[PDB]
Design a protein around this ligand. Structure first.
Ligand SMILES: OC[C@H]1O[C@@H](O[C@H]2[C@H](O)[C@@H](O)[C@H](O)O[C@@H]2CO)[C@H](O)[C@@H](O)[C@H]1O
Length: 138
């Protein structure tokens, strides 16, 4: 496995047709997972499954610019389960990140950060055993 938090370099940032795949297993009694696609200190795309926010499971997505969080986009469809292996695929499309979990479409997140080729790191954190993190051009 990989050590969490884990940093995956994205050389020359991202670009449409780039597919990023994260394989892991959620720990028992998990509280959170986070993917942070960063442009330097900014977070272009924060993808944050929360297992207990007011006794609901929710996915919170956002962007952080100059250390300020923007408007959250929330998704109540929640495909993760404590204890279970997962696959998160993030496909960069021209206008949005497209996220599928376990081969089922989950959400899209429109690009707020425009300099895609400067989004050069993915941080992976939270209550998971991380198996692999990689990318491919499709
Ligand atoms: O927006 C993503 C960001 O959220 C922070 O938590 C928010 C919270 O979601 C919101 O309901 C409350 O009113 O303000 C909190 C602080 O901005 C998280 O702390 C952060 O890690 C991100 O997940």
């Amino acid at each position: 496995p990989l050590i969490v938090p884990y940093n995956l370099p994205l050389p020359g940032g991202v670009v449409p047709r780039m597919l990023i795949t994260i394989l892991g297993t959620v720990k028992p009694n998990a509280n959170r997972i986070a993917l942070d696609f960063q442009r330097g200190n900014d977070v272009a795309f924060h993808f944050n499954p929360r297992f207990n926010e007011n006794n609901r499971r929710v996915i919170v997505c956002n962007t952080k610019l100059d250390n300020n969080w923007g408007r959250e986009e929330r998704q109540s469809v929640f495909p993760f389960e404590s204890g279970k292996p997962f696959k998160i695929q993030v496909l960069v499309e021209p206008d949005h990140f497209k996220v599928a979990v376990n081969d089922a479409h989950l959400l899209q997140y429109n690009h707020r950060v425009k300099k895609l080729n400067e989004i050069s790191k993915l941080g992976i954190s939270g209550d998971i055993d991380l198996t692999s993190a990689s990318y491919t051009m499709i």
